[PDB]
Design a protein around this ligand. Structure first.
Ligand SMILES: [Mg+2]
Ligand SMILES: [Zn+2]
Ligand SMILES: [Zn+2]
Lengths: 134, 107, 87, 1421
């Protein structure tokens, strides 16, 4: 506890002392490049020359989103999207590398334009650790 | 050496370099009242002979440039009548050694 | 010019080894030992290249020579063998 | 590069700066850039034969380069070109292009001024490349005609033709990016075509332009104008091509396309139907784009905006420091093998360790080469995998191919081969560089021993908290991992924590025992503090280097008890001898005062900050010098391990009870504030009845406030002092203060007793509102309560008035703090950039990147700052009587020889005349020493920092040889006298067989030897230290060898050392100059003032000392003060009146009727000018009406008739009438010349002169120094030249804080003296200590160039040092532009140059070369 640092009762921490929740919202849209040329939320795969991410696409459903129960980690793909070029090129959203948690809430709506808009919230319980500030 | 009271006309000043090898010095009577050399802070400056200088540069593997410099107009350089090139040896006391000797080349 | 080399007689630099020379000979030798160079000391069960080089240095069986350059470019070559290690 | 190249591998030894001849640009070009397009021609989304194009380099990861066919990683890029439709001025030279035109005839290309002119011969003489061009231009600019004929050197009557035309020359002015001339009814005005400017430059003679700043081969003036514009390859302007359909070209690509578009408009326009006054429109557009590509941030012009409204990054902007190439990509870099996390304090880590979290150790790696030694272990790390802690990430085969152990199908069956590298995890005890930014120290970055631990923090030992400057308040730190068996050696053998223990910054140790350990060590080391066996045994076990020997208890019979002192002494190692005296310390210490440790065991005294902290004579400072840095590093831990364990169990806390002051003491405090409140009222009502006489050179208000702010502080200080003294020894706050772990008197004072007077800008809270501080008060309220005095403690709590006023003053603090960090920021960097290149060379000399000498031996002594301690020179002080008693041996007097009790020969030694010759010559030199020391240290200061702790050498001898102060010595008089003489000869700093170097050696050891002869005189060595032959010879060898250690190490980078050693203590400065003798601006602002070499300084002052036999006499001083204090007529005048008195014999004013009669017994103007002077004003400046009169009389002479009243006359008046139409207006002129122009008495500028009874140490007739206070005068003005020549003063003493002036009057050498003095007094104001040499160097540097060289962009950065070196600070692009235009050749010997060239700098480890001697090699095998 020397020099503006402190000792914390672990038996207290266990009982839920100074314990907090954490949420992060990831967002995406199906951009319209010109006319009828639109992006598509789906679970992509090895089809011609798509530059897909190095994360787990397997956590995505057919709609190209995680179900709000699943535990997500590392660079696990949480929003699957594809942009076409004149087959398909990857436009997926991985999780923040430096983060991990459980999918809390997936929200599928429409943008003012009339295009698919999606928001993904991820939950984490953070526990008071050794280098934590107070 | 000329000890003028207030001023020397620029017409008279033309005659100063006019007669070499002889060198003419201009000193204001008012400045000479106090001997600056005598001051607490002013250390002892010593003019070095052509040989004394040659030896210094030889003994320290120096170019004339590498040497710490002194202005030709320096109060002590005027006092000793230092001409350009002439090296001065300066002996001051030190709080690390007892004495320390530096050298200053003229400009 | 090769007037750059100062002879053995007439040498002014410290007869002692600089803190930097030690660190560099030790390092240089460690790096060489480390890249499978021949070791001149009996490594008495020794395995770390720096320790092997420190063993080499204590026994003064280091075949290196320090070229100490002066502000003008002239140099004095001193051997690791001939340099006092008071440090 | 990454592939094998046949080509020889060399190092850049020189950087030749030049300019491109258009010709070169064409030859060097791989592509003629033709189309402002990028690609997609004939449909295909692939590079066009115009811009980019494979002729230059690849955009795609293709392999094709089509020039070298090498590929993106390998290929640097290839240059192109655009042949420009018309010539354009290179933006960066525009002014130099103008100045060259200002020098030459714009008709024949002849250097306007010939060698026929004498001043031209003087300029042309200048050997300097640029100063020549500067002197030439100043002479040629004012020449407006090209001479066909000119007067000869022989005779001026018969002129000689020098050649060249006779055209008139234009007055050139810059209009944006164009040049316009003005020739000579009415002057002629026309613009100057680039084409024309170029032709003149082409016609400039080789001899002419080489005499100007230029070079025939690399920098011709004509090349400053562009005709062939080089096109930088794609890697300079990267197409950040995202996706297949999209691109994303760089700013520079657009600017070049913009230039190309502009060029073709002009090329077609001039070729086809040229409207000619539209050609000059498209020409100006190409001139804009080419200028604006190189510089967009142009002086008063429109920024060439990008489509977006964005300004377009110019190439200048790219390299422009802090983040440009130079400062941000070359002097600094983001790096691989680096980590950073939150730092946490750990007591169970060894000093030099660093707790690395497992995750971090599993990320960072080390390239270990597979060798027979490690092959066995390395295969097991490879086996372990990249996921187990002691594992490996990659195996790199000889074939230069990387094996990723995370995926390789062979990851399990890799059979290592010697030579291959295993990039294994960082394991325990690998050396690593740990760092805490801001890095203003050698100490801010140290080498630590890895200790892989769990949990996400970097754990560090608490005693290393101090040099890093780290707190655990959420603080983070960097870690760097060396990759060579060579750079590990660098770290381990040069920058390890144990090594850094004793700092050369202050010749003291930079780490000591802190907080919990400091608090606990006081508590443990007490008479009261005793330990029961159970715990004594555990305390012993905790010390790892315990001998396993239970110490004999201090108390045996009642119950076996041990004292703290006894068991702490277990960590203190044998051979540690420490002695210290505080206040009233006796050898039977009464208060447990001072400190005595023998053979590493405590005898008496409590251990606290002064002992076990970072003190100059520290238990730490001793342990390092006397045992080893490795030993000392262990002592740190061992002390902590014990103390922290005892304190874990003893426990320690703080509560509101510790702020609670005892009731009657609170009554006393309340009363102390109350009596101080009434003492203020008395002074307030006193000043309200005009009685209160104003101080000299101060308002009645200035003086009233001074007294008020004084009482209100006296009060707070006294009331505080009451609380401190009342507080018990058990008071936990007092305990931390006593130990020195945290807390000071003021902290106790403000918490328990009284917060005190709040201050903003030195003055107590002023009236922000009309005549009141807050609406809560009445107007014109000057009370303690109204101007900001806080009556309460922090315990009782502040009132709302008290709250706001404290908050006001508090805020001023955070502002100042925020400002002070910024300011010191710059100060540290200019200090460091001005000294980088200064090193100690193998000739013991101090030089820079030019090889120019700064110091002749580092720090005037040639010693390494780290190996120095304060020691006293015993022969300096005391009575000549006591000197005699302590040093004189006389074998010819029965009561003045050494008694045989001292030495064996004692009986036979008496009467030896030949031996008395030795002791006579010995004392005669000892006497010489005393006279010399007193010449050096004039004040009689004996305690000076020197290299060998002789006191400790003798101490350790007595212990070493168990010397009995009873039995007579076996030394002879020759054994001592001649032994000490022979030691002196072996103390070498400089070795050299010549008079210059040998006489230099003599000087370096001058001071040290005084101390030697002083502490090794025959009387002392026999009577004091009762040394044997053995003891003495050992002492001698030890002095010799210990001295030889203490000298500086060639490669010692003392430039940076000194810079940081001034720069870091600068950052720890509070300032400005308290919150009120003289009030001189000090600290951070004064230092800013010094380095800048500022002419208009904030507080200029003179300090005049009185003439020898006048020091005591106040009246003598009062006289000189009166003789120098500048008095004007204006200061004594009440009113100036212009009356109409037409009769010189009669006066319209009835007062003056008496004055006329008398100054008319024993033609004039009818206009009177009457001046009324003030009696009190005349009396403060001790003037007479006649004095004043004669002064006005002598100013106008025989042009003004002056009459005046006598010093008795009720009204003081001076009447002035003019001598011999439009006359009244003439008197208004004379009245201003009277007030404003006339000087009555004293030296000009010398405004307020103060009387000071300064103290002074000076020798007494008896011998000893004594307090001889003398009178002194202080100023508020500076004029040395005149106040020196003043009678009654000492012009051998007179000092001025304007060192600029002392340089001007007393010479550069004496200017140096004043400079160091000021620099020292800025550092010593904050109390802090910096060793001589550091400030001495900076002062020496600022001076060697005969005059005052500023530490600015203007000063040191305008030196003859490297081009790249200088550009690494402040002017950058501007420096490098001249670099090419003057064809500079960078030597590449500055640190910077190598740092830029990615080469090993000639610094420390790089100052020498290493060679293998095949001879010695074959000899070993
Ligand atoms: Mg902080
Ligand atoms: Zn290429
Ligand atoms: Zn001409």
């Amino acid at each position: 506890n020397q020099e503006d640092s402190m000792i914390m009762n672990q038996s207290s921490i266990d009982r839920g002392l100074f314990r907090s929740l954490f949420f992060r919202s990831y967002m995406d849209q199906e951009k319209k490049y010109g006319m009828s040329i639109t992006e598509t939320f789906e679970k992509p795969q090895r089809t011609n020359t798509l530059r897909m991410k190095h994360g787990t696409y397997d956590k995505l459903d057919d709609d190209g989103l995680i179900a709000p129960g699943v535990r997500v980690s590392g660079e696990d793909v949480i929003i699957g999207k594809t942009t076409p070029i004149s087959s398909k090129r990857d436009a997926s959203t991985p999780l923040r590398s430096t983060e991990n948690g459980i999918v809390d809430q997936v929200l599928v709506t429409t943008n003012q334009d009339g295009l698919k808009f999606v928001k993904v919230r991820v939950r984490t319980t953070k526990i008071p650790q050794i280098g934590d500030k107070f | 050496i000329f000890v003028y009271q207030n001023n020397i006309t620029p017409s008279a000043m033309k005659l100063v370099p006019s007669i070499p090898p002889a060198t003419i010095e201009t000193f204001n009577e008012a400045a000479l009242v106090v001997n600056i050399t005598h001051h607490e802070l002013v250390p002892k400056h010593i003019r070095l002979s052509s040989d004394e200088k040659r030896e210094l540069l030889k003994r320290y593997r120096l170019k004339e440039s590498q040497l710490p410099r002194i202005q030709r107009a320096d109060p002590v350089a005027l006092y000793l009548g230092l001409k350009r090139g002439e090296v001065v040896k300066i002996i001051r006391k030190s709080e690390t050694s007892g004495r320390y000797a530096s050298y200053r080349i003229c400009m | 010019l090769k007037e750059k080399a100062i002879p053995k007689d007439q040498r002014a630099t410290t007869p002692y080894m600089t803190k930097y020379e030690r660190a560099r000979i030790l390092g240089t030798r460690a790096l060489q030992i480390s890249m499978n160079a021949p070791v001149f000391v009996d490594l008495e069960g020794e395995t770390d290249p720096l320790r092997i080089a420190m063993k080499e240095l204590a026994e003064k069986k280091i075949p290196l020579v320090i070229r100490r350059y002066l502000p003008d470019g002239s140099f004095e070559d001193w051997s690791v063998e001939e340099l006092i290690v008071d440090l | 590069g990454q592939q094998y190249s046949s080509a020889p591998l060399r190092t850049v030894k020189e950087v030749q700066f030049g300019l491109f001849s258009p010709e070169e640009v064409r030859a060097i070009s791989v592509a003629k850039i033709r189309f402002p397009e990028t690609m997609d021609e004939t449909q295909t989304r692939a590079k066009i034969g115009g811009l980019n194009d494979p002729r230059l380099g690849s955009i795609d990861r293709n392999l094709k380069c089509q020039t070298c066919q090498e590929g993106m990683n390998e290929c640097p890029g290839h240059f192109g070109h655009i042949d420009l439709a018309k010539p354009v001025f290179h933006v960066g030279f525009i002014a130099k292009i103008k100045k060259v035109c200002e020098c030459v005839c714009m008709h024949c290309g002849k250097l306007l001024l010939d060698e026929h002119n004498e001043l031209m011969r003087q300029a042309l003489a200048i050997k300097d490349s640029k100063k020549r061009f500067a002197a030439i231009w100043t002479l040629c600019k004012t020449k407006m005609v090209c001479e066909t004929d000119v007067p000869s050197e022989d005779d001026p009557t018969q002129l000689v033709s020098r050649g060249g035309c006779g055209n008139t020359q234009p007055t050139i002015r810059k209009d944006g990016l164009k040049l316009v001339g003005s020739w000579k009814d009415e002057p002629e005005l026309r613009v100057l075509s680039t084409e024309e400017i170029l032709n003149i430059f082409k016609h400039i003679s080789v001899k002419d332009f080489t005499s100007l700043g230029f070079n025939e081969v690399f920098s011709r003036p004509e090349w400053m104008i562009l005709t062939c514009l080089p096109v930088p390859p794609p890697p300079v302007r990267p197409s950040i091509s995202f996706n297949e359909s999209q691109r994303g070209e760089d700013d520079l690509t657009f600017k070049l396309a913009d230039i190309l578009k502009a060029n073709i408009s002009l090329e077609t326009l001039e070729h086809n139907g040229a409207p000619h006054h539209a050609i000059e429109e498209a020409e100006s557009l190409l001139q804009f784009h080419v200028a604006t590509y190189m510089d967009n941030d142009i002086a008063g012009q429109p920024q060439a905006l990008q489509k977006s409204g964005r300004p377009v990054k110019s190439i200048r902007a790219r390299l422009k420091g802090k983040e440009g190439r130079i400062r941000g990509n070359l002097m600094g870099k983001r790096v691989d093998f680096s980590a950073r996390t939150v730092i946490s304090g750990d007591p169970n880590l060894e000093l030099d360790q660093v707790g690395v979290p497992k995750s971090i150790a599993k990320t960072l790696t080390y390239p270990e080469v597979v060798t027979p030694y490690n092959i066995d272990r390395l295969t097991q790390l490879v086996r372990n995998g990249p996921n187990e802690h002691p594992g490996a990430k990659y195996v790199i085969r000889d074939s230069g191919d990387r094996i990723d152990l995370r995926y390789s199908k062979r990851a399990g069956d890799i059979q290592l081969q010697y030579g291959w590298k295993v990039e294994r995890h960082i394991m325990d005890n690998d050396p690593v560089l740990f760092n805490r930014q801001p890095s203003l120290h050698k100490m801010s970055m140290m080498a630590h021993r890895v200790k892989v631990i769990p949990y996400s923090t970097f754990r560090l030992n608490l005693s290393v908290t101090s040099p890093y400057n780290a707190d655990f308040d959420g603080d983070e730190m960097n870690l760097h991992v060396p990759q060579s068996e060579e750079t590990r050696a660098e770290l381990s053998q040069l920058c390890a924590v144990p090594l850094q223990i004793v700092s050369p910054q202050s010749n003291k140790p930079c780490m000591g025992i802190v907080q919990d350990t400091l608090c606990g060590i006081r508590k443990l080391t007490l008479r009261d503090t005793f330990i029961e066996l159970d715990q004594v045994l555990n305390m012993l076990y905790w010390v790892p280097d315990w001998d396993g020997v239970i110490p004999t208890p201090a108390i045996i019979k009642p119950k076996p008890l041990w004292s703290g002192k006894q068991i702490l002494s277990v960590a203190i190692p044998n051979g540690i001898h420490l002695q210290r005296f505080d206040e009233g310390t006796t050898l039977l210490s009464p208060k447990d005062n001072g400190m005595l440790i023998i053979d590493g065991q405590i005898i008496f005294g409590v251990v606290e900050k002064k002992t076990v902290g970072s003190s100059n004579g520290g238990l730490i400072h001793v342990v390092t010098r006397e045992k080893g840095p490795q030993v000392c590093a262990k002592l740190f831990g061992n002390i902590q391990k014990v103390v922290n364990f005892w304190l874990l169990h003893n426990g320690f806390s703080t509560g509101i009870g510790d702020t609670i002051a005892d009731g009657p003491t609170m009554r006393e405090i309340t009363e102390t504030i109350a009596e101080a409140k009434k003492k203020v009222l008395d002074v307030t009502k006193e000043a309200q009845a005009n009685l209160l006489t104003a101080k000299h050179g101060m308002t009645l208000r200035e003086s009233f406030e001074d007294n008020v702010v004084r009482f209100l502080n006296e009060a707070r200080d006294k009331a505080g002092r009451l609380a401190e003294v009342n507080l018990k020894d058990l008071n936990n706050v007092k305990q931390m203060v006593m130990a020195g772990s945290k807390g000071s008197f003021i902290n106790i004072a403000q918490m328990s007793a009284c917060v005190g007077q709040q201050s903003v800008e030195g003055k107590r809270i002023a009236f922000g509102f009309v005549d009141r501080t807050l609406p809560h008060f009445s107007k014109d309220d000057y009370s303690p309560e109204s101007k900001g005095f806080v009556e309460n403690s922090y315990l009782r709590g502040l009132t709302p008035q008290e709250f706001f006023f404290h908050a006001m003053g508090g805020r001023e603090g955070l502002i100042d703090t925020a400002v002070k960090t910024a300011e010191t920021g710059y100060i540290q960097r200019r200090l460091v950039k001005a000294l980088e290149d200064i090193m100690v060379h193998y000739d013991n000399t101090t030089r820079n990147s030019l090889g120019n000498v700064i110091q002749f031996i580092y720090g005037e002594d040639g010693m390494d700052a780290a190996h120095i301690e304060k020691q006293s020179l015993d022969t300096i002080g005391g009575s000549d009587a006591a000197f005699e008693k302590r040093y004189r041996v006389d074998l010819l007097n029965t009561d003045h020889t050494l008694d045989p009790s001292l030495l064996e020969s004692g009986s036979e030694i008496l009467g030896d005349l030949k031996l008395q010759v030795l002791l006579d010559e010995e004392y005669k030199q000892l006497v010489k020493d005393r006279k010399f020391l007193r010449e050096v240290f004039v004040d009689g200061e004996a305690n000076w920092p020197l290299p060998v702790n002789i006191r400790r050498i003798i101490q350790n001898a007595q212990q070493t040889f168990h010397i009995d102060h009873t039995k007579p010595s076996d030394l002879t008089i020759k054994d001592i006298v001649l032994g000490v003489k022979d030691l002196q000869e072996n103390l070498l700093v400089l070795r050299g067989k010549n008079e210059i170097i040998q006489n230099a050696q003599r000087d370096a050891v001058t001071l040290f030897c005084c101390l030697l002869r002083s502490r090794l005189a025959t009387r002392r060595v026999l009577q004091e230290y009762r040394l044997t032959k053995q003891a003495f010879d050992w002492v001698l060898s030890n002095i010799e060898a210990q001295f030889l250690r203490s000298v500086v190490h060639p490669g010692e980078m003392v430039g940076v050392l000194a810079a940081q050693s001034i720069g870091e203590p600068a950052t720890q400065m509070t300032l400005n100059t308290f919150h009120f003798s003289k009030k001189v601006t000090s600290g951070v602002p004064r230092l800013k003032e010094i380095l800048n070499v500022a002419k208009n300084m904030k507080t200029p002052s003179l300090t005049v000392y009185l003439e020898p036999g006048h020091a005591a006499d106040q009246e003598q001083a009062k006289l000189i003060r009166s003789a120098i204090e500048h008095t004007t007529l204006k200061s004594v005048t009440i009113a100036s009146e212009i009356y109409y008195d037409p009769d010189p014999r009669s006066t319209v004013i009835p007062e003056d009727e008496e004055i006329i009669q008398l100054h008319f017994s024993l033609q004039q103007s009818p206009w009177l000018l009457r001046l009324e002077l003030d009696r009190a004003a005349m009396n403060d400046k001790d003037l007479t009406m006649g004095q004043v009169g004669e002064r006005i009389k002598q100013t106008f002479k025989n042009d003004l008739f002056v009459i005046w009243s006598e010093d008795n006359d009720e009204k003081l008046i001076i009447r002035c009438r003019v001598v011999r139409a439009e006359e009244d207006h003439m008197l208004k002129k004379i009245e201003n010349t009277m007030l404003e122009n006339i000087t009555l008495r004293g030296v000009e500028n010398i405004e307020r002169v103060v009387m000071m009874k300064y103290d002074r140490k000076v020798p007494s007739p008896t011998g000893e120094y004594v307090k001889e206070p003398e009178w002194v005068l202080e100023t508020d003005g500076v004029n040395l030249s005149e106040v020196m020549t003043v009678p009654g003063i000492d012009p051998t003493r007179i000092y001025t804080n304007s060192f600029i002036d002392i340089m001007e009057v007393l010479g550069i050498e004496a200017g140096r003296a004043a400079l160091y003095k000021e620099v020292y007094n800025v550092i010593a104001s904050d109390g802090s200590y910096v060793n001589y040499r550091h400030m001495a160097l900076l002062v020496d540097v600022m001076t060697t160039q005969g005059g005052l060289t500023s530490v600015t962009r203007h000063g040191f950065n305008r030196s003859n040092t490297g081009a790249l070196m200088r550009c690494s600070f402040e002017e950058t692009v501007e420096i490098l532009f001249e670099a090419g235009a003057s064809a500079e050749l960078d030597d590449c010997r500055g640190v910077s140059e190598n740092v830029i060239l990615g080469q090993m700098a000639p610094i420390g480890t790089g100052a020498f070369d290493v060679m293998i001697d095949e001879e010695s090699l074959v000899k070993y095998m």
